[PDB]
């Protein structure tokens, strides 16, 4: 799963 | 020397080089992290990137590791500082601004229920992590947040707590305030005011 962006 | 990777998958040869040359990969960014290796541009505004920025940790291009392998030695990471002028113009910040952020030191923040529910998973975890690492305190309940010493983060629409605070005379702000403020080492409140 991909590191989420904030 | 301690490093973290973000938006980049380490290969087995890279891990071999790291094991043998007194480097260490960390699961998370901390005050002992020496630099963060980022995947190739365009820059992805990940939790790890924002933590590194908040803590004054340099960002380094992935090419570093491959070049290290090709040279047999630990090159100077400084030759490989991350560069992305497009992101700099897009978000209005400087990658060369490497220093511990102070803009959230001593701040009190409240994240509305809408945000807490509507970001299931990493997103909200990164939010809380970044804020507390940056020296902020999260207030315990919306009642305490109903004060002028508190930054309320809300969704612009479909946020009952947000609207209820607005109807007290209190200003509420978009979640982007956190990321961009970290990048700029300054809180541009008006940019993010919800109205």
Q: For tokens 């962006």, what's the residue?
A: A5
Characterize B103-133 residue by residue with b for buried, 16 or more Cβ atoms within 10 angstroms of its Cβ, and e for exposed: bbeebbbbbbebbeeebeebebebbebbbeb
In a domain, B97, yes or no: no
In a domain, B6, yes or no: yes
Resolution in A: 2.0
Residue B62 CA to residue B8 CA, distance in Å, equals 7
Q: Which residue of A has its CA nearest to B6?
A: A3
How determined? X-ray
Asked whether the beta carbons of residue B123 and residue A4 sit closer than 8 angstroms, the reply is yes
Cβ–Cβ contact B55 with A under 8 A: no
Do the bridges between strand B137-138 and strand B59-61 make them parallel or antiparallel, or are there none, so unpaired? Answer: unpaired
Q: Which two tokens stand for residue B26?
A: 């960390």
B129 & B76 share domain: no
Give residue B76's domain range. 2-91
Residue B62 CA to residue B81 CA, distance in Å, equals 10
DSSP line for chain B? -EEEEES-PPPHHHHHHHHHTT-EE-SS--TT--EEEEPSSSPP-BHHHHHHHHHT--EEETHHHHHHHHHTS---GGGGB---HHHHHHHT--TT--S---TTTT-EEEE-HHHHHTTTTHHHHHHHHHHHHTT-EE-SSHHHHSSTTEEEE--SSS-HHHHHHHTTT--EE-THHHHHHHHHTS--HHHHB--
In a domain, B98, yes or no: no
Residue B65 CA to residue B18 CA, distance in Å, equals 9
In a domain, B176, yes or no: yes
The total number of structural domains that make up chain B? 2
1-6 in chain A: CB under 8 A from chain B: 2-6
Q: Which residue of A has its CA nearest to B178?
A: A6
In a domain, B82, yes or no: yes
Q: For tokens 């209005």, what's the residue?
A: B92
In a domain, B63, yes or no: yes
Among residues B155, B19, B121, which one has the least CA distance to residue B3? B19
Specify whether the CB–CB gap between B55 and B33 falls below 8 A: yes
B16 & B56 share domain: yes
Specify whether the CB–CB gap between B136 and B176 falls below 8 A: no
Assign residue B137 the CATH number of its domain.
3.40.50.10190
B113 & B187 share domain: yes
> In this complex, which of B6, B7, B179 lies closest to A6 when CB atoms are compared?
B179
B73 & B140 share domain: no
Angle formed at CA B124 by CA B153 and CA B139, multiple of 5 degrees: 50
Rounded to the nearest 10 degrees, the angle between the axes of helix B12-20 and helix B63-71 is 60
Specify whether the CB–CB gap between B108 and B132 falls below 8 A: no
In a domain, B103, yes or no: no
B10 & B86 share domain: yes
Asked whether the beta carbons of residue A3 and residue B47 sit closer than 8 angstroms, the reply is yes
């Amino acid at each position: 799963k991909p590191s989420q962006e904030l | 020397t301690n490093l973290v990777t973000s938006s980049f998958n380490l290969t087995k040869p890279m891990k071999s080089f790291i094991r043998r040359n007194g480097l260490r990969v960390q699961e998370s960014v901390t005050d002992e992290t020496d630099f963060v290796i980022l995947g190739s541009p365009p820059l992805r505004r990940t939790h790890k990137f924002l933590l590194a920025t908040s803590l004054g940790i340099p960002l380094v291009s992935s090419q570093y590791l491959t070049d290290c392998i090709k040279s047999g030695k630990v090159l100077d990471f400084r030759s490989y500082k991350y560069k992305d002028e497009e992101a700099e113009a897009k978000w209005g910040f400087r990658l060369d601004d490497i220093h511990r952020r102070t803009c959230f030191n001593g701040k009190r923040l409240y994240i509305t229920k809408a945000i807490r529910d509507s970001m299931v998973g990493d997103s909200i975890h990164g939010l809380y992590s970044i804020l507390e690492t940056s020296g902020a305190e999260i207030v315990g309940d919306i009642k305490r947040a109903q004060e002028k010493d508190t930054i309320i983060l809300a969704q612009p629409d479909n946020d009952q707590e947000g609207r209820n605070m607005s109807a007290t005379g209190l200003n509420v702000y978009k979640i982007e305030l956190v990321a961009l403020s970290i990048l700029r080492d300054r809180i541009d409140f008006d940019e993010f005011l919800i109205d």
